[PDB]
Amino acid sequence: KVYNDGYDDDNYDYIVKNGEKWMDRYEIDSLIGKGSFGQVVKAYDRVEQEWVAIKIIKNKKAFLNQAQIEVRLLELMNKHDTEMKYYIVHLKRHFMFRNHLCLVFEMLSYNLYDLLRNTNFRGVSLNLTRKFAQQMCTALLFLATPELSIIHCDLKPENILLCNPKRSAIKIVDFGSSCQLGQRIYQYIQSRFYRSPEVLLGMPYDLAIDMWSLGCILVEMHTGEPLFSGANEVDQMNKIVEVLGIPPAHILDQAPKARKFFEKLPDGTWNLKKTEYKPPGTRKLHNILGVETGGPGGRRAGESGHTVADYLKFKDLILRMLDYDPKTRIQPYYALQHSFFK
Ligand SMILES: COc1cc(N2CCN(C)CC2)ccc1Nc1nc(N)c(C(=O)c2ccccc2)s1
Numbered sequence: 209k210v211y212n213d214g215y216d217d218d219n220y221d222y223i224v225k226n227g228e229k230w231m232d233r234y235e236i237d238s239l240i241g242k243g244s245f246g247q248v249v250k251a252y253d254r255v256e257q258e259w260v261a262i263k264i265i266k267n268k269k270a271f272l273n274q275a276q277i278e279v280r281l282l283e284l285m286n287k288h289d290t291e292m293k294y295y296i297v298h299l300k301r302h303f304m305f306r307n308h309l310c311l312v313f314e315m316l317s318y319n320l321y322d323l324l325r326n327t328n329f330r331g332v333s334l335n336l337t338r339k340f341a342q343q344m345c346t347a348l349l350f351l352a353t354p355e356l357s358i359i360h361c362d363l364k365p366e367n368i369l370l371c372n373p374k375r376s377a378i379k380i381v382d383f384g385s386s387c388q389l390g391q392r393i394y395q396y397i398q399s400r401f402y403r404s405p406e407v408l409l410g411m412p413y414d415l416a417i418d419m420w421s422l423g424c425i426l427v428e429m430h431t432g433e434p435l436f437s438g439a440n441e442v443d444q445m446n447k448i449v450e451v452l453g454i455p456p457a458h459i460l461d462q463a464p465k466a467r468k469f470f471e472k473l474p475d476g477t478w479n480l481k482k483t484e485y486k487p488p489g490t491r492k493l494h495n496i497l498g499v500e501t502g503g504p505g506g507r508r509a510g511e512s513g514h515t516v517a518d519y520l521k522f523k524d525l526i527l528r529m530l531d532y533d534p535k536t537r538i539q540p541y542y543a544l545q546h547s548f549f550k
Pocket residue numbers: 240241248250261263297313314315316317318319322369381382
């Protein structure tokens with residue numbers, strides 16, 4: 209009949225009314241997004257005299273409890289970053305309002321998908337992609353700090369926010385799917401497009417899955433299209449193999465879900481099960497990026513900082529981020545020292 213004295217709906221979400229005053233402090237403007245966790249809203253903080261995003265968690269135990277884990281990690285990240293210089297959206301404060309847990313963040317304006325949509329999915333330049341890459345590798349180095357050891361677990365374009373148009377800077381948002389390095393409790397994780405092979409294979413995993421996600425994102429930021437746009441896990445694996453070839457046998461012999469995508473011949477090699485696809489590793493990244501052919505779809509022909517030399521450095525890096533072996537895949541510190549960033 210009514211939910212939470214009328215303040216809530218079916219899904220335990222707070223019904224947001226335009227121009228409502230909570231606590232003589234926050235002035236609600238408009239809803240900016242919806243998710244499984246609850247809602248996000250654009251508000252004006254009267255005390256600090258600034259705009260904020262407020263994450264209104266659902267009035268439901270499971271969602272409260274999940275968001276309390278998120279709070280715990282965000283405040284652990286504040287302890288290790290008082291200067292706010294590692295390109296992370298930071299928790300300002302949290303509070304209870306009409307039985308909802310609300311997390312207050314600084315308000316950014318657009319996500320990286322918006323940026324892409326504004327290019328009509330043709331991409332931004334390599335000079336913009338460089339800057340964003342350095343900042344993301346900085347963010348991951350920080351996450352990999354031994355006391356934090358945090359896996360974001362859902363790096364995709366909507367979880368990367370643009371600071372502001374003349375500042376040319378990005379930040380990582382939404383640590384609600386995040387956890388610290390540990391014994392494996394979860395298996396169906398990451399967004400499919402950016403899901404790593406260790407995850408698709410049901411193998412152990414660590415902070416290197418986030419670097420796989422970043423390999424994909426950076427190719428997408430310069431091409432405008434996702435690198436591996438799988439319709440399901442089988443099709444995702446197949447798209448990965450098209451570019452990078454069959455994974456190594458030492459890996460596939462260990463992998464508990466190997467037989468979902470591959471099969472073991474009598475000689476002991478692994479090959480693709482049949483489900484349309486190019487043969488293993490013949491869709492080269494060299495050619496997707498258009499290293500010698502004037503960038504993606506010829507659009508970077510004649511533009512400064514888009515030479516063969518420049519493109520090879522970017523390629524080289526991406527290839528190190530898309531290593532099949534999580535042990536040898538490039539870590540954040542070695543990524544920062546790459547010649548792509550000179
Ligand atoms: C003006 O507010 C935003 C609007 C958008 N969009 C742009 C308008 N739409 C085309 C798609 C969503 C994307 C992001 C924001 N701003 C946000 N700033 C922060 N700080 C956000 C979050 O903290 C956040 C909270 C929960 C999940 C994801 C992000 S969301």
